[PDB]
Amino acid sequence: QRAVMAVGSLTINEERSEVVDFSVPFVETGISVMVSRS
Amino acid sequence: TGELFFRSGFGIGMRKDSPWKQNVSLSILKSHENGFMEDLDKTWVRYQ
Amino acid sequence: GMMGELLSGQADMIVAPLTINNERAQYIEFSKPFKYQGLTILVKKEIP
Ligand SMILES: Cc1sc2nc(COc3ccc(F)cc3)cc(=O)n2c1[C@@H]1C[C@H]1CO
Numbered sequence: 006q007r008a009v010m011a012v013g014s015l016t017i018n019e020e021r022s023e024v025v026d027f028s029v030p031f032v033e034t035g036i037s038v039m040v041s042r043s
Numbered sequence: 044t045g046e047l048f049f050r051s052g053f054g055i056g057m058r059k060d061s062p063w064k065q066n067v068s069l070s071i072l073k074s075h076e077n078g079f080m081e082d083l084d085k086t087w088v089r090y091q
Numbered sequence: 092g093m094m095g096e097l098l099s100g101q102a103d104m105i106v107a108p109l110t111i112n113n114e115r116a117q118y119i120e121f122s123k124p125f126k127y128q129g130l131t132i133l134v135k136k137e138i139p
């Protein structure tokens with residue numbers, strides 16, 4: 006109860022949803038890797 | 044052909060007095076993060 | 092349709108590929124989306 010709304014990059018997780026709510030996501034992302042060619 | 048327009052996802056319809064909100068959201072998160080959605084896609088996408 | 096059936100009491104849970112709209116959200120609550128998709132144009136194949 007030290008703030009009202011949190012804005013940032015907070016991925017939706019079960020371990021975080023039981024203590025704070027979230028709104029409808031507007032940007033879609035995921036987990037990925039990046040590998041160079043040469 | 045073309046490119047995606049008005050990109051909006053699907054959802055589960057419910058009612059404002061239904062107490063099954065968290066119990067469904069947690070199940071959806073479990074399906075997403077435990078590979079169930081990936082398995083469903085692999086079994087229902089890229090047939091050829 | 093489905094929203095009318097839900098509002099009339101004939102149904103309580105909606106599990107179908109239903110999109111998300113502002114008007115629908117003003118009356119029917121939507122859970123977390125399954126997949127992120129948009130709208131595309133379908134054109135029949137043309138022989139060379
Ligand atoms: C704009 C964006 S960006 C966006 N990304 C996604 C991607 O899939 C998920 C799945 C679970 C989740 F917890 C969060 C996103 C869905 C989606 O519908 N959207 C949307 C439309 C508006 C929101 C409606 O739900």
Ligand SMILES: *[C@@H]1O[C@H](CO)[C@@H](O)[C@H](O)[C@H]1NC(C)=O
Binds near residue numbers: 062065066
């Ligand atoms: C799921 O069961 C009931 C029905 O929604 C609900 O009251 C309960 O809190 C839910 N269980 C957990 C662990 O949240």
